[PDB]
Ligand binder design. Structure first.
Ligand SMILES: O=C1c2cc(cnc2NCc2ccc(O)cc2)S(=O)(=O)NC2=[SH]c3c(Cl)ccc(O)c3N2CCCCCN1[C@H]1CC[C@]2(CCCN2)CC1
Ligand SMILES: Nc1nc2c(ncn2[C@@H]2O[C@H](COP(=O)(O)OP(=O)(O)O)[C@@H](O)[C@H]2O)c(=O)[nH]1
Ligand SMILES: [Mg+2]
Length: 170
């Protein structure tokens, strides 16, 4: 009695895609993780009484054109779109990742969660209000996380599972 969920973590270089994924799977914070390493991680968790197998792809994709990135966006069921709260450019980049995914899916309606990572850093440049407004405009949840302190790390991934589960009924 198990359900699979294929999750893809996307976002600009250095926002904490790897740190978030490794904190969820391995319960440690990576200080200086090779920016080019792209790996999948599988873990069983219980969410809302369901035993879930999470298959998570940690992407490191800054290529403009990539057959393999199109393939993982076709295969992925839900997308964690991560920016860093101290990097305005990473926040502006979200629009481009969302557009790429909608194009591959040929759908305006795709399970996504907006994640503002590095909430432990004091010098914020992205107002929580702007991030909430962007998420509202996309019709998706918004969560602020810290891969360093584990704040809302499970919540971000488990919220994305909940989004996928609900879309499966629509
Ligand atoms: O070759 C790709 C790999 C496989 C694929 C896509 N991108 C991959 N790497 C990222 C990449 C590679 C080349 C490139 O030019 C651009 C991006 S795939 O579509 O054929 N397989 C997918 S899509 C996917 C989603 Cl959407 C969610 C969860 C998944 O597990 C998943 N998978 C299967 C695993 C992908 C693992 C990333 N890899 C390798 C696989 C082999 C290895 C070495 C040993 C075990 N892990 C290194 C990582
Ligand atoms: N302070 C803080 N640093 C973080 C956080 N997440 C990641 N980092 C750091 O930011 C850098 C980039 O993280 P990484 O996970 O490699 O980013 P990726 O390129 O998106 O995979 C590393 O130096 C991490 O230690 C966070 O929540 N808080
Ligand atoms: Mg990385």
């Amino acid at each position: 009695s198990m359900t699979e969920y294929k999750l893809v973590v996307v976002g600009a270089g250095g926002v904490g895609k790897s740190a978030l994924t490794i904190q969820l799977i391995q319960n440690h914070f990576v200080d200086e993780y090779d920016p080019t390493i792209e790996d999948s991680y599988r873990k069983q968790v219980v969410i809302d009484g369901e035993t879930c197998l999470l298959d998570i792809l940690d992407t490191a994709g800054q290529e403009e054109y990539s057959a393999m990135r199109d393939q993982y966006m076709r295969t992925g069921e839900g997308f964690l779109c991560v920016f860093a709260i101290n990097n305005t450019k990473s926040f502006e980049d979200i629009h481009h990742y969302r557009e790429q995914i909608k194009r591959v899916k040929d759908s305006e309606d795709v399970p996504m969660v907006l994640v503002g990572n590095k909430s432990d850093l004091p010098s914020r440049t992205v107002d929580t209000k702007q991030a909430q407004d962007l998420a509202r405009s996309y019709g998706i949840p918004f969560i602020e996380t810290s891969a360093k302190t584990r704040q809302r790390v499970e919540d971000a991934f488990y919220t994305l599972v909940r989004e996928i589960r609900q879309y499966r009924l629509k």
